[PDB]
Design a protein around this ligand. Structure first.
Ligand SMILES: OC[C@H]1O[C@@H](O)[C@H](O)[C@@H](O)[C@H]1O
Ligand SMILES: [Ca+2]
Length: 142
């Protein structure tokens, strides 16, 4: 009986053309958001991803779906934040997705009323210093 919240827009501080953030909320687990392939800068990380709902919405957990094919951009250390208004963000948790190739769920112990969620990706798997990529990001209310 859980409701999947509709993501209507988003932003990414780094993306490769054709793999911008909306590719992580198109309902397709094969299509990826992916950070820029030019990953040589010293200040390439962190990479900040923001997901926006239409209105402030109750949220009880989220699921990050990494790419299942290829090792570029599976999230490692992240800071997860939320915003009640879409502008001001509050830290929720530091979550290590561990470069896992499988979905990672984060469950809150209090419902969050959020207009937006934000991921500050401090590290991610892959070639060189790594990347950030996401097949789908999903938010749910019980
Ligand atoms: O250079 C980065 C790119 O590397 C490719 O091998 C891969 O197919 C892309 O998804 C992207 O990760
Ligand atoms: Ca997708």
């Amino acid at each position: 009986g859980d409701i999947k919240i509709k993501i209507v827009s988003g932003t990414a501080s780094s993306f490769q053309s054709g793999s911008n953030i909306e590719k992580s909320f198109d309902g397709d687990y094969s299509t990826l958001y992916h950070s820029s392939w030019s990953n040589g800068a010293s200040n390439y990380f962190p990479i900040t991803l923001t997901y926006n709902f239409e209105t402030v919405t109750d949220v009880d957990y989220l699921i990050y779906h990494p790419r299942n094919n290829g090792n570029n951009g599976r999230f490692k250390e992240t800071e997860i934040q939320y915003s009640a208004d879409g502008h001001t963000f509050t830290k929720l948790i530091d979550k290590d997705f561990q470069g896992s190739a499988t979905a990672g769920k984060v469950t809150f112990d209090q419902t969050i009323q959020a207009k937006s969620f934000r991921f500050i990706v401090k590290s991610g798997s892959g070639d060189g210093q790594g990347f950030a990529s996401c097949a789908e990001m999903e938010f749910f209310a019980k």
